[PDB]
Amino acid sequence: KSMHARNRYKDKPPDFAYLASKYPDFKQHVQINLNGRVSLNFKDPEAVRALTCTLLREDFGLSIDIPLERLIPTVPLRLNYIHWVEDLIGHTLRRGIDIGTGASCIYPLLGATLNGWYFLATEVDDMCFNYAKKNVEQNNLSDLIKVVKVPQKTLLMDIYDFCMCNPPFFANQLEAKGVNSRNPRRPPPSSVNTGGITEIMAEGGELEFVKRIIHDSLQLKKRLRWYSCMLGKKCSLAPLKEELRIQGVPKVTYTEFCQGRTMRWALAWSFYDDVTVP
Template sequence: MALNNYMHPRNIYKTPPDFADLAKRFPAFSSISKMDITGKVTIDFKDPHSLRILTKCLLKSDFGLDIEIPEDRLVPTLPLRLNYILWIEDLLLAIGKKENVWGIDIGTGACAIYPVLAATKNKWNMIGTETDAESFKKAQENIDKNNLSNFIKLSKNTTSSVVQYLLDIETDQRFDFCMCNPPFYSSIQELCESRNPSRQPPKNGFTGSPQELVTEGGELEFCRKLIEESKIYKDRILFFTTMIGHKYNLKELLHDLTSEGIKYTHTEFCQGRVTRWGLAWTYQEYDIEKLVPSKDKIRKKSKPIAYQLTELPSRPYDVDTCTEKIMEILTGLQIKHKLLSKRGKSVCMQMTAFNNTWSHQRRKRRLQKQQEQESKKMRLCSSNEASHSEPTETQKENANSDDKVNENNNKQSKSLLLLCENGKDTSIQEPILQAFLKIFKKENAVLFEMEYISGNAGKEGIHQIVQYIKNNWK
């Protein structure tokens, strides 16, 4: 589903750019565009070079900016970046802050995209921090090239801190906000494995360097470090904000802020078929949730399905035991599950199903029983025939060979049956259901919650899995 309708109301890209006009005005864009038989001008969004040219032309056309985007660095998507800046505008406007705005961009990147947009559009004063030497150099070149050095200052971060080192340097400066688009992944391996091979390829080409996409502990730990440092400098920065790429990380960070009693709000940033999330918190007297209410308008927010788990025979009645049992059931259903967090008496997981393995269990058991009975009959017939005649050595060898062939055929048949259970090969199949699971103790009871995220199995699939767990609990 295209999500452009859910962009920020003031985002100029709610109305898609006129590619035909761009092709007339910019030779570089004309060279990477093509016209179809209907006269519509398009580009190859899977080609990183085309994405780079498009972004450069939009920055020039809409903001008068001449930005160089290195070939080995991330190509910033403007609608998404603009959504973030507009949301910060909302936070500041809610408290009447319009002039002399000071902000920090953590990890500014080679384009310094947030500072240059903020300075050009709103005349905000920005400090951009960067750890990578090459990105720092390119960012400074882009700032100088566009005569924005009066508004933007860069600071090289050689430490492991997020904002602490900067605030130790800028001892007297107070800031209205900090913003950040942290790396998603904790390692190159996680980056490579992050997109399930069963999913269809993304609509847009892949861009970015390891420095921009990988950080120790991944996105979740980076944001947690920012929350910890924010406690120290809560009087120096008014609004702490960050973009989040994974929805389950947002849920974990909301749990963290709630448990600390920190006031927060959050929103969705939408562009094309991409959704990201924005999170903001403050330690000041403002009720940030009332100022700029949290927004989740893409999907109607559904209440989790809750169920009280009963005691298991001869096993402790606690969260660990119940979690282990649920994981056994999910494994038996061939549903992938990933532990997100474990704190105190609460465990959170994410589950992904590619096939409906939980429905019509009685029919499946009946078919399996029939197959076992037929197999016994065949073995009995073979045994009776063998008792009437003594096989030769050649016959024995042939029989052994046939057994191996049958065994291989059975394995292949089972694999094929598994792949085609829903009439689709899983190598090209999207997940039919994704959900959050939570097992936690409340008073003397262990409770289980399942919350729908996405998938065409819908909320009905959630109900069916919960019922399956109930039926197979003991």
């Protein structure tokens, strides 16, 4: 498995020691072992925030400030989704919608920086909405990115090329903790879930959340050219493809986001008949 072909980190992992020597705010978290290898403790929220923030400044020229109490995005995964939307819309101005943009507003900042895309970035959480606004303003992108606070993560709001969404993966707290594990001596993950309650869970999990978005798309249809959501669980892909089939959506496709050991999935659909399906 490989990252997206155009992902800048495909076969080029960041050099932690190089970054440590260049960014003092970062080296505090890197350690090099005796045998000569560098590591972060990805279970430390401050370390992962440092890495993501450092990667965004060194490789993309973005200075972001995010809190430890919300999701800390990981750059390679988010880049795999950005590049897939590039394939979807055929990458003249292109506009997108980011449903639940997070405290980092990372999908708009990347899409605007890489491709000049315009974004409507929505958020339901006061903490994330503030940090998203500040991150758009301090990178001088208020022209391209418009952060809004909405009551619900939905498409039904007061011609667009695409929408993006990190849906809440989980349905209850046990899922949000992963105690739904077969064998108790299962190995724990290498990461942390620092996300807020509206970032990481929803009624009926991502299955019902994405169904909500599917039903929103049935009223909008051609107002957006492509609809897309990421999926955190492989088991969500088949029943959602079936919901698209039962509702009579003509164009449907999906992909895998491959980075590290955790792999993510995504689903896209359209009501146009001109658009090419990757």
